[PDB]
Amino acid sequence: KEKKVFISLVGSRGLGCSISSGPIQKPGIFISHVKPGSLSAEVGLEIGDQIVEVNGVDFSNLDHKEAVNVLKSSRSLTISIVAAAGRELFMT
Amino acid sequence: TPLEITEL
Numbered sequence: 001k002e003k004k005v006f007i008s009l010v011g012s013r014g015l016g017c018s019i020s021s022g023p024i025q026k027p028g029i030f031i032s033h034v035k036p037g038s039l040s041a042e043v044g045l046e047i048g049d050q051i052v053e054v055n056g057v058d059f060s061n062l063d064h065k066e067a068v069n070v071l072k073s074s075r076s077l078t079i080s081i082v083a084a085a086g087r088e089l090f091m092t
Numbered sequence: 093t094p095l096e097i098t099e100l
Contacts, residue, residue: 064096
């Protein structure tokens with residue numbers, strides 16, 4: 001289920017979420033623990049999820065550093081995440 | 093081993 005998420009730094013704080021990289025069977029940008037009150041929680045982010053897009057940039061096979069870079073570059077960017085896209089991997 | 097993680 002392709003989910004949509006828009007992160008915008010309206011105040012002066014990050015999004016509130018982390019990201020991890022998957023194995024070789026399914027490499028990509030995953031979502032890690034998130035902090036409450038931040039934008040991440042406001043959008044409905046959490047561990048297991050998997051970002052498959054960010055401001056147009058396909059995160060299907062985007063490098064880990066690339067994900068953090070683009071996310072760090074633009075404070076406010078639209079990120080397309082798909083539920084279970086990462087949970088499958090987490091289930092180790 | 094656990095996968096790399098980053099804080100945003």
